[PDB]
Amino acid sequence: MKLTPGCFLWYLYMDKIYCLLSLRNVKALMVYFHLLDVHHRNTLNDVLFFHFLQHVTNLNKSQIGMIFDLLDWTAVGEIGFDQFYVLICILLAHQDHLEDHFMYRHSRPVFELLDLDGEMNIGAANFQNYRFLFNIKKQELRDLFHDFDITGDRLLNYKEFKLYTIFCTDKSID
């Protein structure tokens, strides 16, 4: 198989969702994950993940720890190969201008990445974590939160988040 049928379908979905499918990006990510995972137990330690983040993206230690905590939903103290691949695809050279539109497109559900609690609601801590992950002004984030909170309860539903993402994508395309 071409590195499992599930990952093949994920690569096909990424190619259908992105203008450029690159060349062996998933293979390079798998090679980097194999290099990071010393024991080759399909998992990586927090220290190894922070070392890889400092070597590649040169992110802060607190930001790397927050990203690892958000990615590892199992809370087992380790990050899997699939989690590392998902994080790499979410980053996708975030310094580029088109990476902002790629992150606005996000993924198929495009809600659970922001909703760390998982109760179909994104809080102020989740908004701050998203603003730490992707650079954005605090005033702009507050204005976006106020615009999204139509009911004034400071809670974002899945349909409201989808509508906001669609409006942002339409504004960016136009």
Partner 1 sequence: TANVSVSDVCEDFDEEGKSVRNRIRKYSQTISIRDSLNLEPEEIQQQARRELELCHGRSLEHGEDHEESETSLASSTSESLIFSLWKPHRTYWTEQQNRLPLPLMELMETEVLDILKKALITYRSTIGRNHFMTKELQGYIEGIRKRRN
Partner 2 sequence: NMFVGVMIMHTEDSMKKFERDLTLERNLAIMEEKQIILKRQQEEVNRLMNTQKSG
Residues that bind partner 2 (CB under 8 A): 150, 170-171, 174
Selection from partner 1, partner 2, none that 39 binds (CB < 5 to 8 A by kind) is partner 1
Residue whose token pair is 């994950």? 33
Task: Provide the 3-class DSSP secondary structure of residue 80.
Answer: strand
* CB 163, min distance to partner 2, A: 12
Nearby residues of 129 by Cβ (< 8 Å), 6 or more positions away: 66, 70, 116
* Residue 157 interacts with, from partner 1, partner 2, none (CB under 5-8 Å by kind): none
Q: Which residues pair with 80 in a beta bridge?
A: 43
Q: Which is nearer to partner 1, 40 or 171 (CB)?
A: 40
Of the candidates 68, 93, 104, the residue with the CA atom closest to the CA atom of residue 83: 68
* Residue 15 annotated as binding site: no
Contacts of 105 (CB under 8 A, 6+ apart): 17, 165, 169
Minimum CB distance to partner 2 smaller for 119 or for 170? 170
CA-to-CA separations, 63 to 27, 30, 71, in angstroms, rounded:
26, 23, 12
Q: Where are the beta strands (DSSP E) in the chain?
A: 43-45, 78-80
Write down the least CB distance from residue 148 to partner 2, Å. Answer: 12
Which letter does DSSP use for residue 44 in this model?
E
93 vs 150, beta carbon nearer partner 2: 150
Q: Residue 170 binds which entry of partner 1, partner 2, none, with Cβ cut-offs from 5 to 8 Å by kind?
A: partner 2
47 binds, among partner 1, partner 2, none (CB under 5 to 8 A by kind): partner 1
Least Å distance between CB 45 and partner 1? 8
Binding residues: 60, 62, 69, 149, 153, 160
Binding residues for Ca(2+): 60, 62, 69, 149, 153, 160
